[PDB]
Every structure is written in C-alpha cells, then in structure tokens.
Amino acid sequence: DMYIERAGDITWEKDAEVTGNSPRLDVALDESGDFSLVE
Amino acid sequence: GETTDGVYRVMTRRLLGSTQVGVGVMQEGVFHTMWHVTKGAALRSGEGRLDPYWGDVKQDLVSYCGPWKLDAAWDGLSEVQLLAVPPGERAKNIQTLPGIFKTKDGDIGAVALDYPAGTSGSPILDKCGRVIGLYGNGVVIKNGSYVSAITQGKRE
Numbered sequence: 001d002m003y004i005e006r007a008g009d010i011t012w013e014k015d016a017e018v019t020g021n022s023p024r025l026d027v028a029l030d031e032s033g034d035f036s037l038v039e
Numbered sequence: 040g041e042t043t044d045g046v047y048r049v050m051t052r053r054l055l056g057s058t059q060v061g062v063g064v065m066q067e068g069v070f071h072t073m074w075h076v077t078k079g080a081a082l083r084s085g086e087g088r089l090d091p092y093w094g095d096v097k098q099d100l101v102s103y104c105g106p107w108k109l110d111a112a113w114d115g116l117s118e119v120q121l122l123a124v125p126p127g128e129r130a131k132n133i134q135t136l137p138g139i140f141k142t143k144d145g146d147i148g149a150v151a152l153d154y155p156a157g158t159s160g161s162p163i164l165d166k167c168g169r170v171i172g173l174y175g176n177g178v179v180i181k182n183g184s185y186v187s188a189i190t191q192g193k194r195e
C-alpha cells in the first residue's frame with residue numbers, strides 16, 4: 001500500500017548545480033505511453 | 040491528511056523495508072504524479088486517503104483529489120530546474136537547458152539528467168518556480184543514459 005511524505009517546497013534555487021546537455025532526438029510515442037528512438 | 044503545497048515522495052511497504060517508487064506535486068489540493076508510479080492505486084497521507092480522479096497511460100500522468108492543476112509550459116529558450124527528489128536522498132535543484140523530442144504530433148522539451156527510476160514524478164521548474172512538467176517518462180540513448188520528456192498535463 002502506497003503513501004506520501006513531504007520532501008520540500010517548490011522554488012527556484014539561484015546558484016544551483018548547472019549540468020546536463022540539450023539533445024534533439026527523433027522519438028515516437030506508442031498507445032502504452034512508451035517513448036522510442038526513431039532512426 | 041497532509042494537504043500542504045509542495046513536493047512529496049511516494050513510498051511503499053509492500054517490498055523489503057520502505058521503498059520510494061516515485062515523487063509527486065501537491066498544488067491547490069491536488070496530488071499530481073506519473074501514472075507508472077502509482078498505477079492509479081489509492082494513496083495514503085498519514086491518516087487520510089487520496090483517491091485518483093484523472094489518469095491517462097499514454098500521457099503517463101495521474102491526479103488525486105481533483106483535476107490536473109499544472110498548466111505552465113517551457114518557453115523553448117530558457118534553462119529550467121529539475122527539483123530531483125532521489126530515493127533516500129534530499130531534494131536537490133539541478134539547472135539545465137532542455138533538449139527536444141521531435142514527434143509526429145509536435146515537439147516536447149527534454150531533460151537529459153540521470154537519476155534512479157524512483158526519482159519519477161519530480162517537478163521541472165521554470166524561473167518563477169512554476170511546474171512546467173514531470174520527470175520520469177522518456178528514452179534510453181546509445182550511451183545507456185536517460186533522457187526524460189517534460190511531461191505536462193492539460194488544465195481544464
């Protein structure tokens with residue numbers, strides 16, 4: 001049986017860890033909510 | 040039970056010990072999470088009960104106590120923040136510039152950050168702290184890395 005516990009506020013933190021790239025990918029979404037790469 | 044606006048962990052005692060299956064956003068009395076986290080099952084908030092109200096497997100979203108309230112969208116240009124809430128770890132803001140998922144039905148923002156599957160349902164925020172989507176549904180690339188979409192619901 002599932003339950004919820006609070007984890008914090010939803011605010012933008014200035015001076016936060018800036019990481020990660022911005023890829024442009026050709027994708028497909030099926031009826032079951034699964035994304036897939038298209039080539 | 041707990042109705043306070045904010046980010047929450049979705050836990051279960053069905054497996055060994057307490058396990059974090061995902062994350063969700065409480066806003067305007069509605070709990071928003073990804074469908075694959077709860078499977079549309081009812082959630083408990085202390086003594087109180089949260090029942091599902093709206094759900095869709097294809098969008099992979101689910102709302103509790105009311106209709107989907109989150110309506111903000113990525114502007115296509117700005118860096119965003121993933122308020123990642125990882126299993127057994129503190130909530131942490133990670134700033135990144137989203138990529139693009141090009142689909143037959145249109146383009147969607149994409150966050151290329153890598154986290155365990157239990158981080159699913161973590162809110163992606165804009166410069167004003169507004170929730171522009173949820174992290175947890177995407178694809179696995181050539182290098183085994185995870186790229187999630189910025190999954191937003193429709194506010195009626």
Ligand SMILES: O=C(Nc1ccc2c(c1)CNCCO2)c1cc(Cl)cc2[nH]ncc12
Nearest residue numbers: 033034075099154155156158159175176185
């Ligand atoms: O597995 C993950 N997400 C997911 C699982 C099951 C599932 C869906 C998404 C929605 N599509 C329909 C089937 O249901 C996942 C999530 C995160 Cl945050 C990171 C990850 N790194 N590798 C996988 C992951």
